[PDB]
């Protein structure tokens, strides 16, 4: 393992405990690093997932504090709640990949806090339904994200509006 | 007997004389007295177990002769107030304060306490 | 899912998550009691303790050694039994009741025995 | 000691310093001799070397040697084979400590860690 | 690896032991003040109780409950929560005033409808008349306390200096005071409104006593808990120590095998 | 003003007479907040 | 268990207890018991011999000796040779018993020999044929069939757990071979239980068709009960229901 | 990460998403995928190819295999000859 | 050093660091194919180091009243005092000084942790004046260590007094 | 000390102590909470949190990674800028307005940016 780590441009550490915890596929995102770093990934998807790293990193610190059951300020519990929703977003069904055009909305929803609002249990419902809603209504939006692969002002606004329209499912 | 307790500490403990300023004027208790409930006003109190007398400055409370001749006195915060003109200055500030506001009650108390200080 | 069915897979998923949680809080529980942990989690922990005990069934070959006649329960029955337990429907009965017995019905019946 | 015991009929008392350094020395000689150093470094002939040393100390019908040895446990790890092998030979342990000396008590021997297999 | 993660975890356990020890000492310091307060307060309360007994006063409703802002005091918070819940069966519509964060949080979860007034910034302090009086003043106005001819308060009675039983008691409303069986031996006056004054006064005087009792039970429980914590940490030290010692031997062995393998060639 | 608020003010006033004690001052100063609630909803915590 | 917790004493008690059948009239009730002393102080063994002769049991028993001083190959061959003697009794069909104290020290002896034979070190530096040695030894002790005249040769082998680490390679290897284990709990030994055989970790795998029916009837479920005592005392360290108290009081008693 | 905890499955998921471009006309986004299986039993490989045929991605997939049974030199040589393809 | 010592003079030799000396011996042994001892450091490294460290001594008066004081330096492998070369050296040496990294960061620069410093000869040679005014100091600091971790709220006066004296 | 400038050394020593305190006190905050930290301790923590992110500054080679152009902040300027923080002159500036920016002047500018 030491030898290979040096050789590769990045490492994609996976965690067994997180597999059991239900993040299957399970990515140990703390140890998932790319020394070389990112520049290959859809421009649109790059824009949306910008603070996903920060939220998760904060979530990790916060979660440790949280399990001592020590008094948590609201700011930490914003993180905690947000972090929890993100984790639930990460989980994905085996042998079902998801098109990037339909990953851009989900990350938009989450990062723009729409997801953070809606309850943990029904995140799976929201995800499915949101996609269905975009398939029905903002199928133009999906076509455009597929076709142009970078989000314009119009797409960002359209997407923001779309999420708002379907905010409470 | 006569027994006085207070929230930080109280001690009192049969034919003795208590002299009290109460919401009934001033009341004197000598041995058995009728069983009563009296609201204690902010007061200067003298307590005499036997002929020996100890003098207390009391922040108002309640006084209650029980039928078993237990004079239950409950009061908040001391004749220590006898150490005693910042209270007069504070009464002046408080009088001004009544114009804006609880401050009215405060100033009323300040006069009562100031009067009590003047008595002691 | 769809090998043993989605419903089975979902039931199992919840068990795996629950047990993993239970294992996770073993440290915290030991250093400080469950009353100083979250109430919601404490329900999960109690449920998981029940699940663990539920998993024991006497052996039908080491009946002598176990000292209890063995228990083998239908697969179809098993899925049903765990489903109920996860919804905590009958959870309100001793750990002992769950320990070394077959189906949910057997646990319930043994609760009546224990209650007496 | 044996000349004293066997040929002068004496009781003797044999102090040894670190038997850790007895082991350590033996381990080195073993390694120098090219014999495969057994687990935790110590010589594969660790047991046998102790066997000769600790069965040449005995009560003969002339006298008896008795031996007090000092065991410098490495990090107090008794699980290490060199201490373990020593404890097998030892009949009693007197467990001197500085804590006891600090309770003013000299003898500074631990009251409940001093144990013998001859106390019966 | 094994060795460092063992070692780091053992260090954590050690630090925890030290902290739980430390906490226990500070708890003892606090406990002395707490118990002292509870005595003085109770003596004062007893003077009032002499009246209520001799009067034979007796008697929606209010529920007031107290558990400090701070936690890790044991199960003071949740034993009280359970005992509140028991008397919340009795009257579901009763308005719960939660004094301090721990009781606030737990009760807020089971019923939030009840929570109308809640306080904060009580738990860190030792009980004081100032708090009780102001809380009382707010209780009358906010909760319309007088409207409810029943008031009931919950606190933790510190049963033994190793135990606590959550307890409740009924505060005597002015209606109750009016109709108290014996009240004729006691002198009423038309120029006093002794029910309306005594109600108010005993609302606070009882509440301060309840607070002192609660605070003492809380701090006592915390001392007990923090002591038991130290013990639990010790056990964890012992298991990881054996592991540490074993792990050390194993590293030597694994290293040795490499040397032997090299030597063999 | 309520009788126990009135008396509270009296006790507090009575400690400042000319002489003072830290324990007295502690007994007469408290920082607390009425974290106002409503039937869930919370009006803003008004300081004690 | 851990050595010199009177480890030896457990075996002595067995030999003595069956004195009434070894001084019996039926030789198929007389166990002729062999004590293999490996790795022990020659003095201590001599005292043990005196103990046996004090309890006048020596005349039905053999002592084989391989003391701590005695040569490492001799120690290696010491249990095997003893078992040859044991097989003659066994192959007379007559009852016998053999106690191998302590095979863990035999492992160290074979280790010395192996290492000096430059066999490559196994786990914990113990040679790879340590398993072969133990399995070969253990399987030469047996309860034969009726055809062979039911020759018992009851093996009791005493393993010296260093630090009570029962995950250790030599112990686990032995555990897998042996039928049941009689794990001893040192903490309890110290804490006044003498003998302190923890029954949570003691098993026997064919004992349930050995001991008399009386001792099946009377002793029935006591194993369950005292593994209810184990559960009860697990959670004893708060609230105790009268049921729990009853078990705890009974269990302790 | 820890062995066969759907270790294979993470990779297969990538192959499945490579259906979207590959099937797609974009030949400059068409990834022909080479799955190398070293040391794995024939049954494992066989299950994988069935999954790949189920998802009908076995037309752009090449599976170069050297099962555990297949020789140690051939296994050593197997990554390097996959590379050549 | 022997020449100075032999002439009856005194001197101080600081061997810095024997850890790299060990590595060199390791290099020699490995290259000479002589088997390397525990933790791959030569087996008779103990013998070498001990021989070196016993050539530092306070000679007798018939041997001309002279000495060679010595102060060997061992570099810890990240504070690992268990390791074949540290354990061996610790046994040979009479006294240790154990510098503490936390203290360095905490501004005691140079940093020494005197809990883990020991002298096994110590005060036997000490200035008499300095003995008088320094028994107390050991005890005060000892108490200061214990009450260090009680410095994290509501503190007893005794502990607080100790804490004040100790911090200063 | 004097070699890197006595002033520079003293400032940096103060920074190090502040940070070291902060790291130790994180453990106290973790279990005990921030309630057991004194006002003095709390001020040291607030300064450390600000300092921790004052260190954060962009680089020219994370125009590529991010986009922000690097902040080349001269040594003399840094000593001054860090000194100011310790003096508490810019402890009236939010923690995130220390985050990923240049010198003290810039920190003030980003304070204005967050402000409006």
PDB file of N, CA and C in Angstrom, chain A residues 81-132:
ATOM      1  N   UNK A  81     -26.845  19.377  11.487  1.00  0.00           N
ATOM      2  CA  UNK A  81     -28.051  19.089  10.757  1.00  0.00           C
ATOM      3  C   UNK A  81     -27.766  19.047   9.295  1.00  0.00           C
ATOM      4  N   UNK A  82     -26.972  20.016   8.796  1.00  0.00           N
ATOM      5  CA  UNK A  82     -26.627  20.107   7.403  1.00  0.00           C
ATOM      6  C   UNK A  82     -25.810  18.928   6.987  1.00  0.00           C
ATOM      7  N   UNK A  83     -24.856  18.547   7.852  1.00  0.00           N
ATOM      8  CA  UNK A  83     -23.921  17.481   7.672  1.00  0.00           C
ATOM      9  C   UNK A  83     -24.620  16.179   7.563  1.00  0.00           C
ATOM     10  N   UNK A  84     -25.655  15.986   8.411  1.00  0.00           N
ATOM     11  CA  UNK A  84     -26.439  14.784   8.452  1.00  0.00           C
ATOM     12  C   UNK A  84     -27.160  14.591   7.159  1.00  0.00           C
ATOM     13  N   UNK A  85     -27.750  15.677   6.605  1.00  0.00           N
ATOM     14  CA  UNK A  85     -28.484  15.616   5.363  1.00  0.00           C
ATOM     15  C   UNK A  85     -27.570  15.277   4.223  1.00  0.00           C
ATOM     16  N   UNK A  86     -26.334  15.819   4.244  1.00  0.00           N
ATOM     17  CA  UNK A  86     -25.354  15.600   3.213  1.00  0.00           C
ATOM     18  C   UNK A  86     -24.995  14.153   3.170  1.00  0.00           C
ATOM     19  N   UNK A  87     -24.820  13.526   4.351  1.00  0.00           N
ATOM     20  CA  UNK A  87     -24.425  12.145   4.476  1.00  0.00           C
ATOM     21  C   UNK A  87     -25.466  11.263   3.841  1.00  0.00           C
ATOM     22  N   UNK A  88     -26.751  11.599   4.075  1.00  0.00           N
ATOM     23  CA  UNK A  88     -27.884  10.882   3.558  1.00  0.00           C
ATOM     24  C   UNK A  88     -27.954  11.013   2.062  1.00  0.00           C
ATOM     25  N   UNK A  89     -27.525  12.174   1.522  1.00  0.00           N
ATOM     26  CA  UNK A  89     -27.415  12.422   0.107  1.00  0.00           C
ATOM     27  C   UNK A  89     -26.382  11.533  -0.529  1.00  0.00           C
ATOM     28  N   UNK A  90     -25.238  11.309   0.164  1.00  0.00           N
ATOM     29  CA  UNK A  90     -24.122  10.551  -0.363  1.00  0.00           C
ATOM     30  C   UNK A  90     -24.482   9.123  -0.678  1.00  0.00           C
ATOM     31  N   UNK A  91     -25.332   8.467   0.152  1.00  0.00           N
ATOM     32  CA  UNK A  91     -25.686   7.068   0.010  1.00  0.00           C
ATOM     33  C   UNK A  91     -26.326   6.860  -1.350  1.00  0.00           C
ATOM     34  N   UNK A  92     -26.029   5.732  -2.036  1.00  0.00           N
ATOM     35  CA  UNK A  92     -26.472   5.518  -3.397  1.00  0.00           C
ATOM     36  C   UNK A  92     -26.667   4.053  -3.621  1.00  0.00           C
ATOM     37  N   UNK A  93     -27.576   3.694  -4.550  1.00  0.00           N
ATOM     38  CA  UNK A  93     -27.950   2.322  -4.770  1.00  0.00           C
ATOM     39  C   UNK A  93     -26.942   1.686  -5.667  1.00  0.00           C
ATOM     40  N   UNK A  94     -26.565   0.429  -5.329  1.00  0.00           N
ATOM     41  CA  UNK A  94     -25.609  -0.360  -6.062  1.00  0.00           C
ATOM     42  C   UNK A  94     -26.121  -0.589  -7.454  1.00  0.00           C
ATOM     43  N   UNK A  95     -25.231  -0.399  -8.446  1.00  0.00           N
ATOM     44  CA  UNK A  95     -25.448  -0.715  -9.836  1.00  0.00           C
ATOM     45  C   UNK A  95     -26.379   0.274 -10.482  1.00  0.00           C
ATOM     46  N   UNK A  96     -26.578   1.449  -9.846  1.00  0.00           N
ATOM     47  CA  UNK A  96     -27.395   2.498 -10.384  1.00  0.00           C
ATOM     48  C   UNK A  96     -26.472   3.684 -10.357  1.00  0.00           C
ATOM     49  N   UNK A  97     -25.905   4.133 -11.473  1.00  0.00           N
ATOM     50  CA  UNK A  97     -25.179   5.391 -11.541  1.00  0.00           C
ATOM     51  C   UNK A  97     -26.150   6.479 -11.904  1.00  0.00           C
ATOM     52  N   UNK A  98     -25.768   7.755 -11.683  1.00  0.00           N
ATOM     53  CA  UNK A  98     -26.642   8.887 -11.848  1.00  0.00           C
ATOM     54  C   UNK A  98     -25.952   9.837 -12.770  1.00  0.00           C
ATOM     55  N   UNK A  99     -26.689  10.339 -13.790  1.00  0.00           N
ATOM     56  CA  UNK A  99     -26.184  11.266 -14.774  1.00  0.00           C
ATOM     57  C   UNK A  99     -25.906  12.582 -14.103  1.00  0.00           C
ATOM     58  N   UNK A 100     -24.807  13.258 -14.514  1.00  0.00           N
ATOM     59  CA  UNK A 100     -24.302  14.500 -13.962  1.00  0.00           C
ATOM     60  C   UNK A 100     -25.289  15.622 -14.044  1.00  0.00           C
ATOM     61  N   UNK A 101     -26.090  15.648 -15.130  1.00  0.00           N
ATOM     62  CA  UNK A 101     -27.147  16.600 -15.348  1.00  0.00           C
ATOM     63  C   UNK A 101     -28.161  16.576 -14.238  1.00  0.00           C
ATOM     64  N   UNK A 102     -28.333  15.397 -13.612  1.00  0.00           N
ATOM     65  CA  UNK A 102     -29.221  15.175 -12.511  1.00  0.00           C
ATOM     66  C   UNK A 102     -28.459  14.997 -11.229  1.00  0.00           C
ATOM     67  N   UNK A 103     -27.162  15.360 -11.185  1.00  0.00           N
ATOM     68  CA  UNK A 103     -26.463  15.431  -9.926  1.00  0.00           C
ATOM     69  C   UNK A 103     -26.287  16.872  -9.620  1.00  0.00           C
ATOM     70  N   UNK A 104     -26.256  17.732 -10.656  1.00  0.00           N
ATOM     71  CA  UNK A 104     -26.137  19.149 -10.462  1.00  0.00           C
ATOM     72  C   UNK A 104     -27.306  19.701  -9.687  1.00  0.00           C
ATOM     73  N   UNK A 105     -28.562  19.326  -9.910  1.00  0.00           N
ATOM     74  CA  UNK A 105     -29.653  19.851  -9.128  1.00  0.00           C
ATOM     75  C   UNK A 105     -29.555  19.480  -7.693  1.00  0.00           C
ATOM     76  N   UNK A 106     -29.233  18.212  -7.385  1.00  0.00           N
ATOM     77  CA  UNK A 106     -29.269  17.726  -6.033  1.00  0.00           C
ATOM     78  C   UNK A 106     -28.271  18.446  -5.172  1.00  0.00           C
ATOM     79  N   UNK A 107     -27.067  18.696  -5.723  1.00  0.00           N
ATOM     80  CA  UNK A 107     -26.039  19.426  -5.036  1.00  0.00           C
ATOM     81  C   UNK A 107     -26.420  20.874  -4.914  1.00  0.00           C
ATOM     82  N   UNK A 108     -27.135  21.451  -5.910  1.00  0.00           N
ATOM     83  CA  UNK A 108     -27.603  22.816  -5.831  1.00  0.00           C
ATOM     84  C   UNK A 108     -28.542  22.973  -4.670  1.00  0.00           C
ATOM     85  N   UNK A 109     -29.485  22.023  -4.519  1.00  0.00           N
ATOM     86  CA  UNK A 109     -30.506  22.034  -3.507  1.00  0.00           C
ATOM     87  C   UNK A 109     -29.879  22.020  -2.153  1.00  0.00           C
ATOM     88  N   UNK A 110     -28.876  21.136  -1.976  1.00  0.00           N
ATOM     89  CA  UNK A 110     -28.212  20.968  -0.718  1.00  0.00           C
ATOM     90  C   UNK A 110     -27.405  22.147  -0.338  1.00  0.00           C
ATOM     91  N   UNK A 111     -26.588  22.656  -1.281  1.00  0.00           N
ATOM     92  CA  UNK A 111     -25.660  23.717  -0.994  1.00  0.00           C
ATOM     93  C   UNK A 111     -26.421  25.001  -0.808  1.00  0.00           C
ATOM     94  N   UNK A 112     -27.582  25.151  -1.489  1.00  0.00           N
ATOM     95  CA  UNK A 112     -28.391  26.344  -1.391  1.00  0.00           C
ATOM     96  C   UNK A 112     -29.433  26.119  -0.328  1.00  0.00           C
ATOM     97  N   UNK A 113     -29.215  25.099   0.534  1.00  0.00           N
ATOM     98  CA  UNK A 113     -29.798  24.998   1.845  1.00  0.00           C
ATOM     99  C   UNK A 113     -31.186  24.467   1.838  1.00  0.00           C
ATOM    100  N   UNK A 114     -31.754  24.219   0.641  1.00  0.00           N
ATOM    101  CA  UNK A 114     -33.105  23.764   0.462  1.00  0.00           C
ATOM    102  C   UNK A 114     -33.250  22.405   1.086  1.00  0.00           C
ATOM    103  N   UNK A 115     -32.242  21.535   0.842  1.00  0.00           N
ATOM    104  CA  UNK A 115     -32.159  20.204   1.395  1.00  0.00           C
ATOM    105  C   UNK A 115     -32.015  20.226   2.891  1.00  0.00           C
ATOM    106  N   UNK A 116     -31.194  21.177   3.408  1.00  0.00           N
ATOM    107  CA  UNK A 116     -30.906  21.342   4.818  1.00  0.00           C
ATOM    108  C   UNK A 116     -32.166  21.513   5.606  1.00  0.00           C
ATOM    109  N   UNK A 117     -33.157  22.226   5.028  1.00  0.00           N
ATOM    110  CA  UNK A 117     -34.456  22.386   5.622  1.00  0.00           C
ATOM    111  C   UNK A 117     -35.177  21.075   5.784  1.00  0.00           C
ATOM    112  N   UNK A 118     -35.459  20.370   4.664  1.00  0.00           N
ATOM    113  CA  UNK A 118     -36.289  19.183   4.656  1.00  0.00           C
ATOM    114  C   UNK A 118     -35.706  18.056   5.487  1.00  0.00           C
ATOM    115  N   UNK A 119     -36.596  17.355   6.231  1.00  0.00           N
ATOM    116  CA  UNK A 119     -36.300  16.372   7.248  1.00  0.00           C
ATOM    117  C   UNK A 119     -35.578  15.157   6.739  1.00  0.00           C
ATOM    118  N   UNK A 120     -34.734  14.573   7.628  1.00  0.00           N
ATOM    119  CA  UNK A 120     -33.741  13.553   7.371  1.00  0.00           C
ATOM    120  C   UNK A 120     -34.333  12.297   6.795  1.00  0.00           C
ATOM    121  N   UNK A 121     -35.476  11.859   7.358  1.00  0.00           N
ATOM    122  CA  UNK A 121     -36.158  10.652   6.968  1.00  0.00           C
ATOM    123  C   UNK A 121     -36.623  10.700   5.539  1.00  0.00           C
ATOM    124  N   UNK A 122     -37.121  11.873   5.107  1.00  0.00           N
ATOM    125  CA  UNK A 122     -37.761  12.042   3.835  1.00  0.00           C
ATOM    126  C   UNK A 122     -36.817  12.651   2.843  1.00  0.00           C
ATOM    127  N   UNK A 123     -35.480  12.619   3.101  1.00  0.00           N
ATOM    128  CA  UNK A 123     -34.473  13.074   2.158  1.00  0.00           C
ATOM    129  C   UNK A 123     -34.504  12.221   0.925  1.00  0.00           C
ATOM    130  N   UNK A 124     -34.664  10.893   1.107  1.00  0.00           N
ATOM    131  CA  UNK A 124     -34.720   9.956   0.017  1.00  0.00           C
ATOM    132  C   UNK A 124     -35.909  10.211  -0.851  1.00  0.00           C
ATOM    133  N   UNK A 125     -37.060  10.530  -0.214  1.00  0.00           N
ATOM    134  CA  UNK A 125     -38.264  10.915  -0.900  1.00  0.00           C
ATOM    135  C   UNK A 125     -38.088  12.185  -1.670  1.00  0.00           C
ATOM    136  N   UNK A 126     -37.416  13.197  -1.075  1.00  0.00           N
ATOM    137  CA  UNK A 126     -37.190  14.481  -1.682  1.00  0.00           C
ATOM    138  C   UNK A 126     -36.352  14.312  -2.901  1.00  0.00           C
ATOM    139  N   UNK A 127     -35.293  13.477  -2.816  1.00  0.00           N
ATOM    140  CA  UNK A 127     -34.372  13.276  -3.898  1.00  0.00           C
ATOM    141  C   UNK A 127     -35.069  12.708  -5.095  1.00  0.00           C
ATOM    142  N   UNK A 128     -35.897  11.668  -4.868  1.00  0.00           N
ATOM    143  CA  UNK A 128     -36.586  10.969  -5.917  1.00  0.00           C
ATOM    144  C   UNK A 128     -37.572  11.870  -6.583  1.00  0.00           C
ATOM    145  N   UNK A 129     -38.367  12.573  -5.756  1.00  0.00           N
ATOM    146  CA  UNK A 129     -39.433  13.439  -6.164  1.00  0.00           C
ATOM    147  C   UNK A 129     -38.947  14.664  -6.859  1.00  0.00           C
ATOM    148  N   UNK A 130     -37.830  15.256  -6.386  1.00  0.00           N
ATOM    149  CA  UNK A 130     -37.251  16.459  -6.926  1.00  0.00           C
ATOM    150  C   UNK A 130     -36.855  16.185  -8.339  1.00  0.00           C
ATOM    151  N   UNK A 131     -36.224  15.010  -8.560  1.00  0.00           N
ATOM    152  CA  UNK A 131     -35.784  14.560  -9.851  1.00  0.00           C
ATOM    153  C   UNK A 131     -36.951  14.353 -10.764  1.00  0.00           C
ATOM    154  N   UNK A 132     -38.064  13.802 -10.235  1.00  0.00           N
ATOM    155  CA  UNK A 132     -39.277  13.559 -10.971  1.00  0.00           C
ATOM    156  C   UNK A 132     -39.873  14.863 -11.394  1.00  0.00           C
TER     157      UNK A 132
END
